[PDB]
Design a protein around this nucleic acid. Structure first.
Ligand SMILES: Nc1ncnc2c1ncn2[C@@H]1O[C@H](COP(=O)(O)OP(=O)(O)O)[C@@H](O)[C@H]1O
Ligand SMILES: Nc1ncnc2c1ncn2[C@@H]1O[C@H](COP(=O)(O)OP(=O)(O)O)[C@@H](O)[C@H]1O
Ligand code: BEF
Ligand code: BEF
Ligand SMILES: [Mg+2]
Ligand SMILES: [Mg+2]
Ligand SMILES: [Zn+2]
Lengths: 343, 363, 369, 248, 366
DNA sequence: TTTTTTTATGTACTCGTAGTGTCTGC
DNA sequence: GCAGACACTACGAGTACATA
């Protein structure tokens, strides 16, 4: 219930165990390595038998068998590692968890692992009853701007030297995909145990395998950088989200931006953003975005976008995903189109 | 007659040692440095594209982890267990074709042999090729085996589309990513292969084969088998010229370049190529329109795209700036009108012919 | 090349085929593993069936003329050919070129085969502990402690029996977790000490191949395998890695309390206690008083009935040994007439034996609420 | 649901209906485009309650005399209703009262009356389907033929369980093939005399027919390779079956 | 409970003999030549617009293939096999509601039992109707059976359009294109049917029903059955004129001349009057296009008017004299585009108003 | 820090479950 | 006998994918 960060969960792990542990937060790899650290700490301590249970609706609780009966040949305590569903559990499972805690033995440990829960799921009967002694901890992957420091810190922990150019190429190639980042770090360490990597082969042992959620796409398109936007779209290949999500995203911000430009003659852009708290990390990134445009520019953007909107859904076009390449690139160096398209 | 069955060059020239693997310096060197020392993760995931060496490299790890000498980055040459793995039969390596074994009623049984004693030689090691076809419950069984793997065993793993695996097993496995071969790598390897047995070869045929291989080495070997077949035991420029009808790609830019003037036989040759190739005429004209639109974009901006056709950044630019924007707009009007009316022409080839004739009618 | 000649009868061929092709069900990785190896050597037929884990080899006498050779036949098809033929009919077999032809006078079949060289065999080893145990004794050893196996467990070695030997006696450890079981029958001849793990399926096959005959079972245990011989039948099975620890520790060291009652009386009483009102949720709740066993009912459907049993009791009073399922497992396999139970502590486990025999000792740790 | 007219009453032991349905159930259509082909045809005659089932390629007709005057009436009952009716048959002592209507079939068993909806179609004329000339006729032991056909079929083609009879003078030769070529040949001594002939046909169907009737001595009738085979028992003529050949 | 249920004309008068079929002379001649001469084929697909007779031709061919007389060009009609096919009982004519039975599962099921000999007939005809709604897997499943079927099985395909079929199947059958039936054939067939059915009819009413069906026996015959409900027992000219919404009056050319002279008020008044009277709008624009065509044709070549055009020549020739040749084609294109967009308009009257305003926008000076 | 928002119809595959044939030492 | 094994086969659901 404490709702702390794993940098402190390590501290509570070093001290006396605070009964059941619940580590949450959507994690690429940090959840698994935190689980591994918990496993090794427990193995050093009493609890050694890690029984893996997948918490899911429509799946009966075989954990009661461990809960009601104690181990007989090697007790050695034991730990129940629970895997939560990606949407959270239901009331039946939440109350059966409380029943299990009622069946808890002194050598039993409860570990609940999952993603962020809903408020009712968070404040269920089991969590409420365990709020007296259990702990809660959450973590999330670093952002784009927070990546270089994290990568450098991990490199310094692993006793391998990095460089600014190497960090740049890593944060470009592996942006938010820490599993790939960790594998690349291990590969660069094992390839050359010299301990000096500046830019000799870091690209040779690093591919383009990273996640890219749509919110950053306009962040490039608002500068109108042709090569950068084209490279971002090429990076989006092989993890290709269906076009509808990207289309919804850019229609959202373009409707917001056209409303902003309509109201620009009225109350200034900052106090207008006061209504448009879309948390674009300052609401000022949109402020520098709106600096480079024109009303005719917005017309040329919206015509192509709305033509695509019927180009993929009215007749089910197959090039429409590649059309996202077409629409984003043409806006980069189009101050205003002299009609000739006006879709 | 029924003698001299030259089996495929894909199978005959299959690498036997790490020195016979073309390209992929990073994977080779990484595993070489990892084999001398004992830091071996219990599961090695290999991923790449069509026909590169993932399966070959996996055979090489089965060769290396199991030998009389021991765990060696260097090859073995000849020693019983690794000798046995040159052919199919081998006792402590079992190759589960995961495509044929997807259900748990099979893969649970196969993984249930992990707790048996290993056969002759240490490191009971099995190669589950094409892992992306395992069922969800099969992946759960694999995960339960990976979380508490027996120390005396390891097992490799391969795929082609790594995005289909669960994040748990991907995070657990020490994934190596195997890169697509570059054109020079494939060309030199094919040169070596042809020189090895008996077949004469000219260089242009080999550049053409490498270009048409699209990067996969197995693809290059299949095309060299076809080239040998068509060329009657000689891969000369003529058999690969017959292949040139398939590997000839750059066609949409040449017609755009020839539209702005009367080049004579260029338009006729290009339409003959398009008809004999039979590509989508609607897509052909859409590519025409896209090229013309980015040209108009460059007219109002001296470097509007830059990354467009880096190989044609010395000819496309001339028509990107020399041609008046009014002519570009008129050509766009002509091509748009042609596309709008294209399906209603007697034939789409006739329609694209008429679009070209209308474009050539004005200037 | 090879051309073998079978001349056999159904009654002397049906049973070996069953024993060699029972476990061969399902689809194996090598197609040859789905096949049954026929060898005609001297006046002997060797039928081999494998699963990369256990080999069944049946020997059949060939009184009628024959020709040596080796081939492999689809097991299901050959068994269905031999089955269904008229009783007492003679099967003759000639393997010509590629195909094997079977004949029963008015019937002829042509079955496709696979070369005998492709068939895998298990390499020879040294059998450390070789003995000729009485078949009935081995049957008792398996049955008195086989009900507790813990199949499909994370330990990946708890799934198999353990066999331990000392001098002229041996024991079978039923590694289960919350259950333990051991059985102390003699061998009659001195054997060295050896601990061996045998998989669950191997145990099932080894107890099935007994057939309840009189022929002693010749069992050879090596470093990485075991072999069993009964009559003209041979069974081979690999071993599991990992060693199960000592089992005598789980035994109650100081059983302050003892109970004793007729085997049939306890059987009926606990059968009722398990079927009357204690089915799913925990179940029985035990209260041991002087010559009294008070059983309380707990079930999801809230049928709560209390029953008192008259069992001879040495002690004052105790509670909280009520693990119904495992004590049922013990009771069904007791094979006793009068049963004596040792209880030391509620937290610790409970031992069960015969009142006048130690043919099977059971250890069950009760569950707490 | 209300009562119906055109309602003839039946009085018959459940064993009679069980024998009838068990005689003509294995040859009833299952999810076929011919919608009337599903279910069984119950036809009333002054002699028996004849029943007809067909897939278009297995025509099984059973005729158990009932001993009551029956106005001529032809009914088709769907697959579901037939299966349920067969499930409700047991005992063999209670008299089953079958009540036919224009659109429904009711039946009184013991103390319960159950009803089933009735397929709307016009069933084919089975008598024309039955061959018009039994010029080539043979008799053979029922269990012998059944055993021989099982033996031959164990190597038959999996998807198309197809064997071939070769009928010569007092001899039946069964020949079966399959992918992954395997040949099964079996010779039976039969009571046949006539023209030499070969005919390919499904073996699962014939095994099913022999399983259904299971008499002492069967006899089949047939003319030519394309001609369908009409199999019945040599004791009586109450049950007849028609199997359509493979190949052509 | 009438005779079965086909008291409707659409089912009662489907032909039972090649002699009884109307039009389709080329395909009937081809089928008769194939049947009699011996050149037979295993797969015919009849493609044509709706209500032309591809299903009927297919069933009649199935009759002709399995008549006890032999492979006869004209089916017996009285023999037992023809009667059974008429009843639908015939166990070798396997009709398929391929629009309803689309799953590849059922196609595979019906292909597994193709090897069986026919129960009674010579040929096991697989009549498939509405083939174009087979799932792609079903189309490709039919391939190796369509190409080389056994000697005894013949396929019939009856699809509304041929171009939706894969080019593989389209290249393995005889494509018989059923030519759409012209007005005279429809009129003669309708008159013969009505004379057989003993209900009085007027020739001009039949002409209306023919010209409104756009070449379809089923469509025209359904329209006649609709008129019988309206016109009591008789297909009378007045009743069918009111039902069909024909432009009996002369307001068509009146609003034509109002529109070409940019008289917006007059055009709107005429539209309001027509809507009040209860006009139909698609026929209005069809008449517009016809009148414009006549005006243009006499603008090029005089003395081209006929009957009613030759009577209203006093106005038509004046319009051809005053309207330039270039503007006539533009008016015609605008009117036909408006007719194209009539379905894509929430109100038909509003769509016609939109079309007329688009036309008047050519010369919107006043 | 919680934030918008495409379908119908069809085809496969794999995992439970459920119902049923068949038959084996019990 | 025979019920329980034991197999085997069919059906629904959940999921992944395709194409118009
Ligand atoms: N690194 C390599 N060295 C030599 N041959 C290779 C290499 N990679 C691919 N090949 C060729 O391609 C064929 C198939 O290779 P394979 O390793 O199966 O590719 P994949 O990664 O797609 O499974 C091999 O037989 C070999 O001829
Ligand atoms: N060629 C024709 N000859 C006679 N009647 C026809 C003809 N074509 C259509 N019909 C009439 O149309 C009705 C439906 O015909 P049908 O053959 O089903 O057309 P479709 O090709 O659209 O399925 C028939 O019942 C018949 O009255
Ligand atoms: F075998 Be590879 F993945 F094409
Ligand atoms: F086109 Be028809 F109405 F089948
Ligand atoms: Mg591969
Ligand atoms: Mg039709
Ligand atoms: Zn070696």
């Amino acid at each position: 219930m404490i709702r702390l960060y794993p940098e402190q969960l390590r501290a509570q792990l070093n001290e006396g165990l605070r009964a059941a542990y619940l580590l949450l937060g959507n994690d690429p790899l940090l959840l698994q390595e935190s689980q591994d650290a918990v496993r090794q700490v427990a193995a050093a301590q009493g609890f050694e038998e890690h029984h893996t249970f997948s918490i899911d609706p429509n799946t009966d609780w075989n954990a009661i068998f461990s809960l009601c009966q104690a181990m007989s040949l090697f007790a050695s305590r034991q730990t129940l590692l629970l895997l939560l569903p990606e949407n959270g559990p239901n009331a039946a499972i939440n109350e059966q968890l409380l029943t299990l805690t009622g069946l808890l033995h002194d050598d039993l440990l409860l570990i609940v692992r999952g993603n962020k829960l809903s408020k009712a799921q968070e404040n269920a009967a089991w969590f409420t009853a365990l709020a007296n002694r259990s702990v809660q901890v959450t973590c999330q992957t670093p952002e784009q701007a927070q990546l270089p420091r994290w990568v450098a810190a991990r490199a310094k922990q692993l006793n391998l030297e990095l460089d600014d150019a190497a960090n740049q190429v890593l944060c470009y190639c592996y942006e938010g995909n820490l599993l790939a980042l960790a594998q690349a770090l291990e590969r660069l360490s094992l390839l050359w145990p010299d301990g000096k990597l500046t830019l000799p082969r870091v690209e040779q042992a690093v591919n383009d395998a990273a996640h890219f959620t749509p919110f950053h796409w306009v962040d490039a398109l608002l500068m109108g950088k042709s090569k950068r936007a084209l490279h971002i779209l090429q990076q989006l290949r092989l993890e290709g989200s269906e076009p509808v999500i990207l289309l919804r995203t850019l229609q959202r911000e373009l409707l917001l931006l056209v409303n902003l430009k309509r109201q620009s003659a009225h109350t200034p852009l900052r106090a207008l953003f006061d209504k448009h708290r879309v948390w674009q990390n300052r609401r000022g990134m949109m402020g520098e975005a709106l600096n480079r445009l024109s009303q005719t520019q917005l017309r040329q953007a919206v015509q192509l976008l709305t033509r695509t909107e019927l180009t993929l859904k009215q007749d089910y076009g197959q090039s429409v995903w590649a059309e996202l390449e077409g629409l984003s690139l043409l806006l980069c160096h189009k101050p205003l189109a002299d009609v000739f398209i006006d879709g | 007659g029924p003698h001299m069955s030259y089996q495929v060059l894909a199978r005959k020239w299959r690498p036997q040692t790490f020195a016979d693997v073309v390209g992929q310096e990073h994977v080779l060197t990484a595993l070489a440095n990892g084999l001398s020392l004992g830091r071996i993760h219990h599961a090695y995931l290999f991923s790449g594209t069509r026909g590169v060496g993932k399966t070959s490299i996996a055979r090489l790890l089965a060769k290396g982890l199991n030998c009389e000498t021991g765990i060696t980055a260097t090859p073995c040459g000849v020693c019983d267990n690794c000798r046995e793995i040159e052919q199919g039969r081998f006792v402590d390596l079992i190759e589960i074709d995961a495509a044929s074994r997807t259900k748990v009623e099979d893969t649970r049984d196969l993984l249930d042999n992990v707790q048996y004693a290993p056969a002759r030689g240490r490191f009971k090691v099995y190669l589950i090729d094409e892992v992306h076809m395992l069922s969800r419950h099969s992946f759960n069984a694999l995960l339960k085996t990976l979380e508490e793997p027996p120390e005396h065993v390891k097992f490799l793993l391969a795929t082609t589309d790594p995005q289909k695996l669960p994040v748990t097993i991907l995070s657990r496995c020490l994934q190596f990513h195997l890169k697509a071969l570059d054109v020079e790598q494939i060309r030199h390897q094919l040169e070596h292969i042809l020189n090895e047995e008996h077949i004469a070869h000219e260089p242009r045929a080999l550049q053409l084969l490498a270009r048409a291989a699209e990067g996969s080495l197995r693809d290059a070997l299949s095309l060299t088998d076809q080239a040998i077949a068509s060329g009657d035991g000689q891969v000369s420029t003529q058999a690969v010229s017959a292949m040139l009808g398939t590997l000839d790609d750059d066609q949409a830019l040449s017609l755009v370049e020839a539209m702005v003037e009367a080049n004579g036989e260029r338009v006729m040759a290009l339409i003959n190529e398009a008809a004999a190739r039979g590509i989508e005429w609607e897509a052909l004209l859409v590519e025409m329109l896209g090229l013309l639109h980015r040209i108009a974009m460059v007219q109002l901006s001296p470097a509007a795209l830059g990354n467009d056709m880096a190989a044609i950044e010395l000819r496309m630019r001339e028509l990107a700036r020399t041609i008046p924007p009014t002519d570009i707009q008129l050509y766009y009007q002509t091509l748009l009108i042609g596309r709008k009316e294209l399906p209603y022409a007697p034939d789409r080839r006739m329609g694209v012919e008429m679009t070209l004739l209308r474009a050539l009618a004005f200037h | 090349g090879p051309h073998m000649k079978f001349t056999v009868e159904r009654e002397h061929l049906l049973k070996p085929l069953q024993q060699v092709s029972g476990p061969l069900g399902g689809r194996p990785t090598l197609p040859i593993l789905g096949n049954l190896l026929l060898q005609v050597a001297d006046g002997t037929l060797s039928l081999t069936g494998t699963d990369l884990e256990m080999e069944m080899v049946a020997r059949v006498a060939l009184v009628q003329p024959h020709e040596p050779g080796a081939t492999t036949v689809p097991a299901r098809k050959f068994f269905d050919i031999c089955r269904g033929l008229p009783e007492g009919a003679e099967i003759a077999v000639q393997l010509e070129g590629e195909r094997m032809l079977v004949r029963s006078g008015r019937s002829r079949f042509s079955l496709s085969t696979l070369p005998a060289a492709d068939f895998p065999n298990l390499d020879d080893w040294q059998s450390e502990v070789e003995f000729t145990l009485p078949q009935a004794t081995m049957k008792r050893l398996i049955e008195a402690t086989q009900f507790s196996m813990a199949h499909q467990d994370v330990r990946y070695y708890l799934n198999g029996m353990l066999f331990e030997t000392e001098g002229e006696e041996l024991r079978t450890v039923a590694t289960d977790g919350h259950r333990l079981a051991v059985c102390s029958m003699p061998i009659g001849q001195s054997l060295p000490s050896h601990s061996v793990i045998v998989p669950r399926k191997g145990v099932i096959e080894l107890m099935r191949m007994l057939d309840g005959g009189d022929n002693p079972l010749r069992v050879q245990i090596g470093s990485n395998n075991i072999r069993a011989h009964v009559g003209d039948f041979i069974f081979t099975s690999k071993l599991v890695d990992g060693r199960f620890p000592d089992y005598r520790r789980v035994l109650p060291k100081n059983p302050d309390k003892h109970l004793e009652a007729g085997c049939d009386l306890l059987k009926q009483a606990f059968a009722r206690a398990a079927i009357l009102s204690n089915e799913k949720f925990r179940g029985v709740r035990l209260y041991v008083s002087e010559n009294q066993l008070k059983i309380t009912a707990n079930n999801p459907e809230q049928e709560e009935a209390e029953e008192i049993l008259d069992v001879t009791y040495s002690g004052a009073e105790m509670e909280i040994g009520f693990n119904v399922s495992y004590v049922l497992d013990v009771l069904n396999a007791l094979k006793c007439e009068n049963v004596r139970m040792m209880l030391t502590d509620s937290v610790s486990s409970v031992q069960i034996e015969d009142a006048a025999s130690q043919s099977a000792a059971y250890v069950v740790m009760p569950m707490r609420l």
